[PDB]
């Protein structure tokens, strides 16, 4: 209907942490994210997560094949964490 461009982004995972480790951060500091290795990365539209999909490398380029679209229940489950 409309022909507008949007900045779609892919998010690897989340991290809830206080700024203790933030100020302790340095080159080489280990950080752990909320998402474990294997689950689909999150496809966000203008920062709005709409999908989940798995990461591939094609022609030495990052890409994501969208596995599924999210549901309001899973969305709220992710938010309440």
């Amino acid at each position: 209907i409309m022909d507008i461009p949007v900045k779609l982004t892919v998010e690897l995972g989340r991290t809830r942490m206080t700024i203790k480790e933030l100020l302790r951060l340095t080159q080489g500091s280990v950080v752990a994210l909320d998402g474990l290795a294997g689950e689909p990365l999150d496809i966000l539209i203008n920062g709005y997560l709409i999908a989940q999909g798995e990461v591939v490398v094609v022609a030495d380029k990052y890409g994501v094949r969208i596995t599924d679209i999210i549901t309001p229940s899973e969305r709220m489950r992710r938010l309440s964490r």
């Binding site: 290795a37 294997g38 798995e54 990461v55 094949r65 596995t67 309001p72 938010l79």
Partner: protein
């Protein structure tokens, strides 16, 4: 454990034990054994191997080429399953069916299945489908419908991605001295809605007992309190403002006409705010309901 992550490292560790799936597999194995006896006029024995919950690509990579791949519909579950008929099994079945006693060595060089071989495939596939439906009916009734047949794993592409986790169930069939295999491949998405039922079978008197259990469950959980937090207003600030912030500072705010009541961040209702009895109160206009 500090190693750089790289793509295509599908370290998908999803470990479960579907006892109900195992029991359905055994019932279907017995049904298929009796059906094979009825058709071939010979008595097979079917051994149900361990259930392999493995990625689709890994499952397909082990499949011999060519092979019979039969797409089936597990109604009402969204998605399609697969029945894998091995060349050795189809060879043995056709040999027995068309006058061969099977004493001759099995010579599988690799070739497509002819129309007559296709009809034989259709027949024992129909028997397998009926037996599988019979086995499943004990736990959950399903309708199984044949879709089509393929010779190559690339023809099927049962999953959205080759890395999708899938369930495979092998069966080793022996008739006299002739051995064959056939497999049942169902995507994990087929069984995810019924994962709870497939993990544990420990119920046999459950037709209205399930309804009674659910009614008891709801009427007993209806006595559990919650944590209603009503976010009155929302101000965005910066960390410099937070650090320099001092008591007596007034923070501008857009006027909240509607107050959202949420629990653990989960929105519950939309309401108006007011004062009654000397306490803050919320008059509910609409509960959060999709």
């Amino acid at each position: 454990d500090i190693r750089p992550y790289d793509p295509n490292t599908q370290r998908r560790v999803v470990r479960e034990r579907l006892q109900a799936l195992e029991i359905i597999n055994e019932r279907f194995a017995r049904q298929f054994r009796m059906g094979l006896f009825n058709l071939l006029r010979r008595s097979p024995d079917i051994t149900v191997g361990a259930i392999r919950i493995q990625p689709y690509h890994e499952f397909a990579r082990n499949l011999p080429v060519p092979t019979n791949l039969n797409l089936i519909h597990l109604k009402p579950l969204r998605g399609t399953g697969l029945v894998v008929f091995s060349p050795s099994l189809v060879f043995i079945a056709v040999d027995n069916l068309f006058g061969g006693d099977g004493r001759f060595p099995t010579k599988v060089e690799g070739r497509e299945f002819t129309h007559t071989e296709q009809r034989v495939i259709n027949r024992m596939l129909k028997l397998a489908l009926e037996g599988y439906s019979d086995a499943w009916k004990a736990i959950n009734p399903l309708e199984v419908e044949y879709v089509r047949s393929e010779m190559q794993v690339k023809f099927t592409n049962i999953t959205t991605s080759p890395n999708d986790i899938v369930v495979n169930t092998p069966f080793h069939v022996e008739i006299g001295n002739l051995t064959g295999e056939f497999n049942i491949c169902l995507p994990f998405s087929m069984i995810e809605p019924l994962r709870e039922l497939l993990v544990n079978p420990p119920l046999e008197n459950s037709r209205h007992e399930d309804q009674n259990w659910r009614d008891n469950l709801v009427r007993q959980v209806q006595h559990s309190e919650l944590e209603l937090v009503a976010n009155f207003a929302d101000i965005p600030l910066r960390l410099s403002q937070i650090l320099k912030l001092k008591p007596g500072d007034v923070l501008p705010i857009e006027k909240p006409d509607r107050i959202i009541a949420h629990v653990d961040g989960v929105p519950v209702l939309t309401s108006q705010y007011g004062t009654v009895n000397g306490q803050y109160a919320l008059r509910v206009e609409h509960l959060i309901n999709p």
